[PDB]
Amino acid sequence: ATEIRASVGKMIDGIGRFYIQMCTELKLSDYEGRLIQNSLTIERMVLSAFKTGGPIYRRVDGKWRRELILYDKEEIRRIWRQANNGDDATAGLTHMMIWHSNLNDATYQRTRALVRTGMDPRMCSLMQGSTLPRRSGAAGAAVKGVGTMVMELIRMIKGRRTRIAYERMCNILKGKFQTAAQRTMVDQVRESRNPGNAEFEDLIFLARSALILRGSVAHKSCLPACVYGSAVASGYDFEREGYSLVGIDPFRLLQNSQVYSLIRPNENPAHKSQLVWMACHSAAFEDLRVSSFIRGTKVVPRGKLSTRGVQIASNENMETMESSTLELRSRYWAIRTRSGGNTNQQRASSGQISIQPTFSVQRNLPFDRPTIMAAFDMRTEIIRLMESARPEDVSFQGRGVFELSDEKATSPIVPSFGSYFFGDNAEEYD
Amino acid sequence: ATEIRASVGKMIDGIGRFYIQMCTELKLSDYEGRLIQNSLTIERMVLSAFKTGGPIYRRVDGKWRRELILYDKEEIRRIWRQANNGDDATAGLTHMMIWHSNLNDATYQRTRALVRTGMDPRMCSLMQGSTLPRRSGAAGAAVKGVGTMVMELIRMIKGRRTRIAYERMCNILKGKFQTAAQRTMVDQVRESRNPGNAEFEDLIFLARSALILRGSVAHKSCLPACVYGSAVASGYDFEREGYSLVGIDPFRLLQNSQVYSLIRPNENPAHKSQLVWMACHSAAFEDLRVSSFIRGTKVVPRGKLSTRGVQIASNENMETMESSTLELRSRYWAIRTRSGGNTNQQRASSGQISIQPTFSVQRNLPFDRPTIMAAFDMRTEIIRLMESARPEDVSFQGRGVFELSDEKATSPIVPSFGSYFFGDNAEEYD
Amino acid sequence: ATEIRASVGKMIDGIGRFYIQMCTELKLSDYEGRLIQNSLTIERMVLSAFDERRNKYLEEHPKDPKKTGGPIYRRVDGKWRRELILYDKEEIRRIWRQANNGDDATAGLTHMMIWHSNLNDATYQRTRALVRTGMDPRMCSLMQGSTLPRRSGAAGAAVKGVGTMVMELIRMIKRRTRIAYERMCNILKGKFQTAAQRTMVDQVRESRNPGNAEFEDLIFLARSALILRGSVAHKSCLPACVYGSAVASGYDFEREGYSLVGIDPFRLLQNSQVYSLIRPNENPAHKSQLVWMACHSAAFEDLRVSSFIRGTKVVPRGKLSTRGVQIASNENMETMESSTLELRSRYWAIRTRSGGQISIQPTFSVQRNLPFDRPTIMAARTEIIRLMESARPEDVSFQGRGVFELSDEKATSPIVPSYFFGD
Ligand SMILES: Cc1onc(-c2cccnc2Cl)c1C(=O)N1CCN(c2ccc([N+](=O)[O-])cc2Cl)CC1
Ligand SMILES: Cc1onc(-c2cccnc2Cl)c1C(=O)N1CCN(c2ccc([N+](=O)[O-])cc2Cl)CC1
Ligand SMILES: Cc1onc(-c2cccnc2Cl)c1C(=O)N1CCN(c2ccc([N+](=O)[O-])cc2Cl)CC1
């Protein structure tokens, strides 16, 4: 707890000090250093370094300008290592990768990659950290969704360190499944010699089941490097105060930060804001209802967002680019979870699924058809188990949201009530 | 294109000139000639002729009066042929039949005819042109729904020109199915010698499948004969301008026309208007949402309509009949389609059917149960195919509605969102 | 002109640059530097150093005369710490001039005084001052700039309300320097929009040895200004930390220009984050309202139009769950928390110095009011009473003019939509 916050606090302090340093080298104004487009470029540089470069955006003569500078990968590596007091500090590096992953999960649908892997494009909610490199951190492995892990394994399926790297991924995936039957099936894929089609068939099954019998996937609020550096510069001490990725800390920091974004002509600044907000709290596949309740303003589906990606291609001309303040604050806050929700328990039920007519009145007589009709080796155990599940089943009982003043999480607020961020395109209306 | 509009333009000009002629014979005032009840009677006469007669409604001494005149079927036939410059002009005749069919599809449910044919009364959406005579036009065959065609075939099943007339109907029905499996099944019904129960069983199957794997059925805006004649009389040239049944033309004409209807005491003139509007654009079984969006005012289900049929039986007394203006104009317009929508393609999917919890918050965890659970000879190919379909699947991508000023259909408007016109009676609430 | 806009941007550059220097001297954190409480102390320091009267006096009557102070605040060992810091006045004066390029630039000092005056009008209704002078405590709404000095510069004089001038005059009447009396009368007359009020204001101006009749005039002349309102300038003057922070981040007010009545101050607060210390039983939202109102001279406005511009409700004073911004020496620092001040707005509006078809002929027999623009048609001591009785609380002003989007930099498309100290 205290020990966790200590190290997390150190790596964020590292990223902070690096950014500030990196910002001075480029002779950037404070405002300019707080432009999200600049942060990502600087973030890109240090990851690429471990020549390199990219677009830097300045405010020259009343108009936005785009230079693109280059640095020695040795020069960058030296700046990173030294900002993290001697050490190579891989931890801060993989933290920036996860922030990039989170934003990629919010910005882009990845059906094109799904169809080549033989996977249902509707499995997107299982795809957390798919753009994240194979053999990422321990932190990376935690953040990767069930679908991400299935997709990595099929690519393998399609130099006997291959054997262990295959076994390493099966165990990662097994750790994520919350039922014994799903876990056992992963053993059968892992135990297999010369992996082929049966294994493919099985992994596609397991992916599908993870939509109802959800896996344990970690979520980490990871902010652009400018937010961290800005704080360090303003006099916040991440090592003395400690820090959390899953507590109030990131919400609290975003409440005291001001980030900017370059915005295109037809784009809506409010919509750009939602995208980066979603990315910041790793909520691309979180129910839109709960996101909305937390943020305070409506969190609208991807297809209704009047916005393109955060990054700006070298194609388009800067002469029409303007700068908006990204709204990243929130009405409430909530603890980020590793849980997938209830996948069994079985204990009791408690509820009502039909009515008994009391009054002679013309009307239909409602009943939960799926549930009533439902009740009439390891594969069937799963089928039988996910068939028992209802969309109405409640997870995270007792758990709620908190006021920004309730930093001890003493008094939770349980909310009362579309849901899919990616369920709103030209092919389907979900 | 130009050639199509040329002939369509001619037959509408024919119907026009006939009506004007027919109106003078009966010494009818222009207003009286634009009474929908009078148009249908005149329409009835020329169809019956190919003695005859029916009720004609006049404005005498401040009250509505009902005479019923008679004509020689030779006299009528002469008036029709000569209004269409020499030719027998069957094309204009079958056009009036389709207008009658459209209005019958909007006015009356036909479950009584469905139960005798051994068909599910819920198949009404497949029943376009069921009141239309067997061996109608080529135009008639196009307008007939899948259920209409199945019902005709069972009646056959229940003089070896019978053999071809059976084969002719199987090929009509086959043309309508958009999948190969459905088409193949029709071959098996057609190839059969001595048609009996297996064929019945099969046709009931095919009808059912056509609710999800919809067939290609044509739709034609066909207006009462008074609307056409009124235009010709006012100086519109249908041959010079050409005409379309599926383009902007009928919408444009309705925007420049004023039709009247006799309305009963308790009836709502707004509701009478919707019925004739639906009939005019062949939209009895079109989604109520899209109808509403096009019309501009709400298109209400049949069971919520405070109106009886357009026609007035010789029973009821005229002394309480009054005359209302039928509102048949529209906010937008749309192209009438021959398509049934997507019945396969299969190519990709793109969407989201579940959520991954990000925040520890008490709530249910939504998922598309039908779709997720779904994925666990020619008959089974169809079952397997319609089981893959979801109510959420989007058809007519890119296609939208148009402003009445956008006659070239250059800039479409894609709308964002009950649905069943006949899903609102004392037995069921759909 | 751009020049008018560039000289205003020059002084904000000065204030900004001065505040930055001051913070480095006080070894303050950036966060600590953006605490409204420190900003005030620092602001209070400069004005004290240039308070020649107090300095001339101290040169005669011995304290530590060369120094000046106030409480600075820091966060130490997880808790806020108040400390009385004493600073050498000459060094403050040097840093001011240096941050204003050798110039003593008293317009920069006056700006900060108007900010404090705006803050004072937001916090306290000043009934005791009013009754002592012999005027109605209800005249509350004409008291803008009353907490300012008598000689306060051109900007300061422009900001002062009608009742402020009246109070100054009555103080003098009840009390070589006939020039000060006559000058203040001109400054009073210039505020009056009607010619009838302007005439009576000259009768008082042109008088030797003013007494009863002159005192009685001003009191009625003030009473009239409640209905027949005066031309009182409203300027958006922000805490020095706001300006300091912007300069520090790289905003160039001289180059970019700046106004106190345009969109500028609204834009700045949109890109600012100001903190306040907050007592245990205080609503941070209500403190924020208070400072927001003080920022935009909004104290005596209609609450409705203030709410409409703001976005959230602008609750009246006696229903506001917060006390003053400053913290007294007797207050317990161990209970102090610091919070963000939400000072952003939904729309913006120009800040005024000010205080076709005329009728309708009915066509349809329908129950309704048959409206007519009362002023235009009808405008064709006793005259004052007549004018006051003629006017109605439902008659509209600033016709056509509305509010603008934050995105609408120019005055393109306006949007056409109560007592803060109400009993
Ligand atoms: C004024 C003012 O002056 N010094 C401070 C100040 C500075 C440092 C520590 N504590 C304080 Cl109080 C201050 C202030 O009120 N702050 C600054 C830091 N804030 C913050 C709180 C939590 C998180 N987090 O969890 O990431 C991030 C941030 Cl930046 C809270 C708001
Ligand atoms: C006045 C006025 O005088 N002559 C005309 C006039 C007459 C003939 C042709 N063009 C024109 Cl402009 C006119 C006019 O404005 N009309 C009349 C015909 N209209 C119409 C347009 C389309 C369709 N259609 O597609 O079936 C039907 C109809 Cl009736 C449009 C409105
Ligand atoms: C990113 C980013 O990088 N450089 C700038 C930048 C910096 C300086 C000038 N212009 C710009 Cl655009 C920038 C940005 O978008 N800003 C900073 C300044 N802002 C601002 C706008 C108006 C007023 N005012 O009227 O007082 C005050 C302020 Cl501080 C608007 C938001």
Side-chain angles (χ1 to χ4, degrees), chain A residues 4-9 11-19 21-26 28-62 64 66 68-73 75-77 79-80 82-84 86 89-111 113-133 136-143 145-159 162 164-166 169-190 192 195-207 209-239 241-297 299-301:
Chain A
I4 298 163
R5 289 180 63 84
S7 46
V8 175
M11 79 146 168
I12 272 82
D13 204 83
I15 301 171
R17 287 180 174 283
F18 170 77
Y19 198 81
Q21 182 56 234
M22 215 59 224
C23 266
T24 61
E25 296 273 298
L26 296 173
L28 287 170
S29 79
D30 176 44
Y31 286 127
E32 282 152 21
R34 288 190 270 140
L35 188 72
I36 192 89
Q37 279 84 32
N38 282 322
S39 200
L40 292 156
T41 288
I42 287 164
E43 287 153 23
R44 191 165 179 180
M45 266 142 74
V46 70
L47 296 166
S48 182
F50 278 96
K51 280 208 187 306
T52 192
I56 294 298
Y57 310 86
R58 287 187 171 88
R59 181 80 182 168
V60 192
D61 225 55
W64 279 103
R66 172 181 55 202
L68 52 99
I69 41 82
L70 295 173
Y71 271 71
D72 258 16
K73 290 186 167 183
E75 166 86 338
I76 301 292
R77 278 187 257 99
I79 297 172
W80 173 254
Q82 287 301 312
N84 285 80
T90 34
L93 292 170
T94 156
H95 180 83
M96 284 177 286
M97 304 195 93
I98 294 160
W99 146 242
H100 289 141
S101 174
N102 284 345
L103 183 58
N104 284 164
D105 298 347
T107 311
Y108 303 104
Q109 210 151 2
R110 282 174 51 72
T111 78
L114 281 165
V115 286
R116 267 185 263 264
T117 328
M119 300 181 69
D120 200 320
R122 289 191 190 103
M123 290 165 162
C124 69
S125 55
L126 308 166
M127 298 312 293
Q128 199 179 259
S130 66
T131 74
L132 212 66
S136 199
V143 148
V146 171
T148 296
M149 301 273 47
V150 167
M151 185 181 71
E152 277 178 40
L153 285 159
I154 296 159
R155 284 165 167 167
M156 294 277 280
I157 284 157
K158 288 197 194 299
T162 307
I164 63 148
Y166 177 83
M169 274 154 57
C170 288
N171 296 326
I172 297 297
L173 178 70
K174 190 197 185 165
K176 288 169 185 181
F177 285 119
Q178 277 163 212
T179 82
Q182 287 176 305
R183 287 196 152 169
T184 308
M185 197 158 296
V186 172
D187 290 334
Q188 290 158 38
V189 180
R190 185 177 46 81
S192 162
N197 285 129
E199 288 71 59
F200 165 80
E201 287 298 305
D202 281 332
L203 297 166
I204 254 68
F205 183 87
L206 289 155
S209 70
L211 297 164
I212 303 178
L213 309 176
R214 275 164 271 241
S216 307
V217 189
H219 299 263
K220 295 172 180 175
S221 280
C222 305
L223 317 178
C226 62
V227 178
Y228 297 149
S230 186
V232 181
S234 287
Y236 194 85
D237 189 0
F238 287 105
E239 290 175 340
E241 303 292 346
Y243 194 77
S244 181
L245 265 43
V246 299
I248 190 167
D249 306 59
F251 280 84
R252 221 202 207 283
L253 178 54
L254 283 180
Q255 209 81 28
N256 293 100
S257 308
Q258 196 152 13
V259 200
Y260 293 95
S261 186
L262 296 156
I263 171 143
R264 305 180 183 90
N266 264 22
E267 293 184 321
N268 184 0
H271 291 153
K272 274 269 183 165
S273 284
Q274 183 204 294
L275 184 77
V276 187
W277 186 89
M278 294 186 87
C280 280
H281 295 112
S282 167
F285 316 110
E286 174 60 287
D287 186 338
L288 290 172
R289 305 185 298 164
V290 46
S291 300
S292 301
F293 188 78
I294 292 169
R295 184 159 178 246
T297 53
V299 175
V300 138

Side-chain angles (χ1 to χ4, degrees), chain A residues 29 31-32 35 59 64 260 323, chain C residues 246 250-253 256 258 264-265 267-268 271:
Chain A
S29 79
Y31 286 127
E32 282 152 21
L35 188 72
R59 181 80 182 168
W64 279 103
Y260 293 95
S323 180
Chain C
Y251 196 88
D252 200 336
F253 293 91
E256 299 275 358
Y258 193 75
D264 296 75
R267 289 272 301 278
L268 184 50
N271 301 266

Side-chain angles (χ1 to χ4, degrees), chain C residues 361-369 371-373 375-376 378-380 382 384-385 387-388 391 393-394 396 398 400 402-405 407-408 411-413:
Chain C
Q361 186 88 191
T363 302
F364 310 90
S365 71
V366 175
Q367 189 168 35
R368 35 73 190 268
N369 66 320
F372 49 93
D373 279 15
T376 37
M378 280 286 281
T382 307
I384 310 291
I385 306 294
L387 281 153
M388 282 170 68
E394 43 270 24
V396 301
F398 301 100
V403 307
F404 305 100
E405 294 279 290
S407 51
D408 186 23
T412 319
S413 36

